[model samples]
Target chain A: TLPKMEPSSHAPTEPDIQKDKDDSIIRENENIPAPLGTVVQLLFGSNTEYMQKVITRDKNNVNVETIPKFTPSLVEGGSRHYEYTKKLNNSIGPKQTKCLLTESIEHMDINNYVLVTQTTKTPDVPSGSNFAVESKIFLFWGQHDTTNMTVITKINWTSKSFLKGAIEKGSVEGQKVSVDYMLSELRDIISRAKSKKPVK
Target chain B: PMTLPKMEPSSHAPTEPDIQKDKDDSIIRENENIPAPLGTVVQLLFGSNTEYMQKVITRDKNNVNVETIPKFTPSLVEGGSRHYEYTKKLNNSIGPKQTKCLLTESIEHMDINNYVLVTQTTKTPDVPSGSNFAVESKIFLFWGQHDTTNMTVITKINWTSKSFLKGAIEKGSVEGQKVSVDYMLSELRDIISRA
Candidate 1:
């Protein structure tokens, strides 16, 4: 509901606009580390001949490649539903070697705030069935298009559903527990990183 | 409990789809004489133009071509609850008044078994005090070779500190109740009381 005025007008006042600059100036005094690095000189090609050479080199050997998976199955949900899902995964040519269990893993492009999902194997289990392990993926440091600090995007282990029945049937316990866990984990992680205040 | 007569579902002639379908469905929902959400059959008819929509009201509670009239009735269950039916009559400065009413009494389109009463009368002749009425409307336009606009209006009223419930498509000095109950009875009751 917009301020009890005529239907459509919500531009802010000039004083409120200066708040961003004031906050950044205070932040600069507190010694916020500058982000590392610049784009490579060789990668910057503005000519047709240079572009052709770049394309030929890229075709022959690309430096950025998907990391080889190791120590897979880092989480687990030990129940009948988990076993059923594991059977489904094995049938679908996923390596039979099981380590732990995880549920729908989420990958993110935080730069663009886009989500990349690999949840095709996720199952919507029927009522009266206990779901233990839904999905599990091993994570390690992976190179990014921008940052040198490699980061791992792994499933948070505690974010699991050990449900034996339907939510509509009052089978689950505390409401939105998974979301609460995720938010708390994020807050804890970001707070620690902020406390360290690592320089570039 | 009053035992309602069991009547078999009657078949209506399969009429061809006219130019207006949404208005007709709305009208049928308005006219049907059966408790909604239980199961009952109802027949409705309506036509719409650029400016107005008209729906005739009829229910098993009584037989009357109820124009725009607001009717209130006592509740069946305990706690002294009262139900309301809203109606309206609109007229341009130079032309005839087009009447429209919005009420949730007996809808044949819904399941009748869910309701204790299947045939509650629609429309009222009285206005509750301090009627906090709100109006919201919209019109969408499509343009290419020719331009056309589809307009719709929504009117809601909250009375006695209750939440505002949507009533009907309003017309005229719609912000407040203007017509007296006597005038409504003399005109709407004499001609078209809740039928």
Candidate 2:
């Protein structure tokens, strides 16, 4: 059992960045040919005005009712918050599960950094139910130097059940497979665009 | 290996199966007997004057009547979260006048319950003789839980302003929101903790 439960501050310093490397969830990275701002804007610039078409779920395993809808906020450090509702038709816990996911871009600097957290609002999911998998935190981070940008992702299974450990391992494996596919797809977009503009 | 007997389910009275021994003052308070919830519920209460706000800051219930607190009702429930919208008038201090505002805010409750964002717009309804000058305010109520009765309160309002200020009217409104929001946050936590 974990000792304490602390909420995410989103704002990460040097030590926090070091600590991030230690998480059990495998930290993966992808390199894009475009600048940080351009890549991020292309992928994450959906606001109340329009919905994001690039970020989609695997059609084979899932059908998304509503993806994330981001709206610009006047936060100084740079931020945007979004809301979406979808059903996980397949894979791990999210498969065949319905949830309201809210992803907040607590801190986003299109040119360099972005710290985002996506969590479904499941008041208290009942034990022994597959919905437990829906109650996970999809913590994503994006950072770059000047030209190259790296995206890091991890899903902290928030299931408080006795099967938490087993569930997490399965979740990591499931997410690892799915996210890698998306990452590869993103790279394909990057390569396809090469000297031209990338797809959102 | 021998078989063990099945345990029976009990009432909510003392059945806190999910005990958090690692909790500290930061999460659970001293007075909390059943710390089932993660954080405390905190709500902001607005006042007409600064002394009322000071009374809120200090939690001076003896000097300041406690029940008079809910009169302003800064926190409005919406979409399973608390949304705040209230027009406040605070002293400008620069010279001597009122800072009128039309403050609208939305909260983050589900899972991510640490943020509150408010838009300070200059509209005719609240600002009276309103102008285009506007700004936004933010607050982070770390460790704050959502419950109507025994609220969890930890609020620190963040400030942001706009250009020039439009001379008068909306002049101090943006600058004025800094103090008003700060005080409003203080009042909210006070109202939350006292309840």
Candidate 3:
């Protein structure tokens, strides 16, 4: 368990600027070089909606042992509920475990949507080492539309062993989970809205 | 009246044919037809330059009697830092008052591990009615990367408004008032240069 903490009273105050008005102006530095890195793109398709791509530099037969699966149960006018889980085992790497729960709500009148997803994981550990548990939660909200939507995704996680892993397989390890479970659920709703299904 | 600086004629101006060439290059990627309005000009501003655009709003309370609100305008300079301006127009018992702000931004670093964008706005002689004046404001944009497959894009915006004054403050004084001022000054200025 994390220890409790108290707020400090000696917080810094804003500086007093009686003179040097031009000092307030901010100028950009002209020396930095151009940016470099691989440019990845996002695609759209039926199966591509829930796709997640993990990219690492070097590899020696490390792979995901358990395919992540999401199951949706409750579906209604403005809300959806689901659960997801995945596991990874590396003979030459750390074993990994992941679990997630998601809920999405929509307001059709205002075209507003909100999705909440909670995730728990065990960082890859040695073959026989005890696994330490870590968890993270993400909140995504956006304005909905027919062809396009604007959404913001916010993630929160504890500072325990669930923090980012050290670079071992590659220089930089990055993973991109394409769409949130909430979006996946919403896509179904949009599809149903266009279908000829009868409403009870 | 605010004493405005005489902006030097930009030597970086590209000719009409030069801009058309750039627009033609962008059109080659996707030839989807547009119904009306936005032609080559609009496509150039919002099309190829979509990545560098940023919108930020800031509000501050230094004293109970006065409040400072500034809206930032973001633009990318080829060899220099990202440029922006924060402008505010105030209407109160004194009269109509406006403040033109100066600011600049720098990329501390943007990478897979860490991303930081910083902006600083200085205090000017501009003031509003009564005891209102300017205060220095600094803004930061921190970013993180997640799993994704595509050259796909997703944006999220969070905005909050609070009242520090005793009674309810007028919406026009603190809100939507800067749209016209910023639209005319920053938007027109950058559009003319880019288009």
Candidate 4:
């Protein structure tokens, strides 16, 4: 008798993160500033018509994990499959479209690593013709608006170019969603200060 | 038969009446192709060499009121009297100096309220008062990276100048910060498209 095929593992039990609330996944550090302002502008592409709703800031409390997000979209190019042969147990990575993190102004630490989880679809190939690939992108950058510096940090093994079609995300880690909001606001104040021009 | 108060030769005072009027009654609003013509020359009177340029928009060569609005004050020297860390450097450059306005040419006519911008190269020797000095400037007439394309064109004046002017103009908006290369580029594109 043929071995019964195992049922698919990802069954909607995965937590749904709300932009305005904090989750246990990524906690916050209290040492950072609070009340980062609203992200006045966030677009997927330089010319993308639609902008995504971002949980721009996190809580100001001193002890929490940095929040991260899972953005689900169709991968644009390439047909390659990645298998984490190194895993103790076979755990598939989440299907990824592309993701961005605003290291534009956040500190980094090992305890605060960006944990990503994504999912993808099976090959649309005909029967007997099988193919598999892992497509995901994650980018981290730190922009110090006050000091006028921006840094590009760690990138995932499967990510591509820094520009065009990558999703950008960041958060302030805290118990509450307001902490993330505060971080967003604080970054904005510095950003505004950096790009001021003369009268017409 | 009018006697107006005389300003010092290099008085960085409030906006002159004519300059303000020019901004208000810009004719090129509906047009697109033409930018307010702008091409300015800059020179430091004292014998100093630095990487900054200044464009003096004045009525006449001698009686000039810098086209620069008085409200925008960017630090000429990185970390000079102004504490902002302009870049990777420190308080390495500072002094009492003279910046000569070289050119101010508009791309669009008097009505459209656009200007083609340029500046003296900060690399040249401080040409003696009557000596000749050359300025190098870039025009930021459009939108750029790091900001929304609220504008079509952006002239990259010397970085310090760019910051100063943008800060001054944005004060009139919700952002409390004004114009950027991106905003200018968008405006230029709109005006030209209409034209």
Say which candidate scores most in DockQ.
4
Tens-place lDDT digits, model 1, residues A129-166 = 22222211112111332212211122222343443222
Model 1 CAPRI quality:
incorrect
lDDT, candidate 3, at A179 = 26
Give the per-residue lDDT of model 3 (tens digit) for A1-200. Answer: 11111211112112111222111111111111111000000111112232232211112113423223322321123222222323332443444433332323222111121122223233333321222221111111211211222222222223333322442111112111222322333333333333322111
lDDT of each residue in B63-110, candidate 4, tens digit only = 223332222123222221111111111111122132333332222211
Compute the lDDT of residue A146 as modeled in candidate 3.
19
lDDT winner between candidates 2 and 3: 2
Docking class of 2: incorrect
Residue B35 in model 3: lDDT = 15
Q: What is the TM-score of chain A alone in each candidate?
A: 0.24, 0.56, 0.29, 0.18
User: Compared with the true structure, what per-residue lDDT tens digits does model 1 show for residues B1-195?
Assistant: 122222222222212112133421211110111111111111111111101112323221122344443221242222222233333433222222322233344321121122122222223222221144323211111111111111111222323344332232232222212122112112322222232
Which one wins by TM-score: 1 or 4? 4
Scanning candidate 1 chain B in windows of ten residues, the lowest lDDT window is B140-149
lDDT of each: 0.22, 0.33, 0.24, 0.22
- Arranged by TM-score with the best first, the candidates are 2, 4, 3, 1
Provide the lowest-lDDT 10-residue window in model 4 chain A.
A83-92
lDDT of 1: 0.22
Which parts of model 3 are misplaced by more than 4 Å?
A1-96, A102-111, A120-159, A162-175, A180-200, B1-195
Compose the digit string of candidate 3's lDDT tens values, residues B1-195: 122111122112111111122211111011111111222222222223332122112222111222222222342222224444555544442333555544343333222122122323233234332133222222211221221101111111111233243121222222222232223223323433343
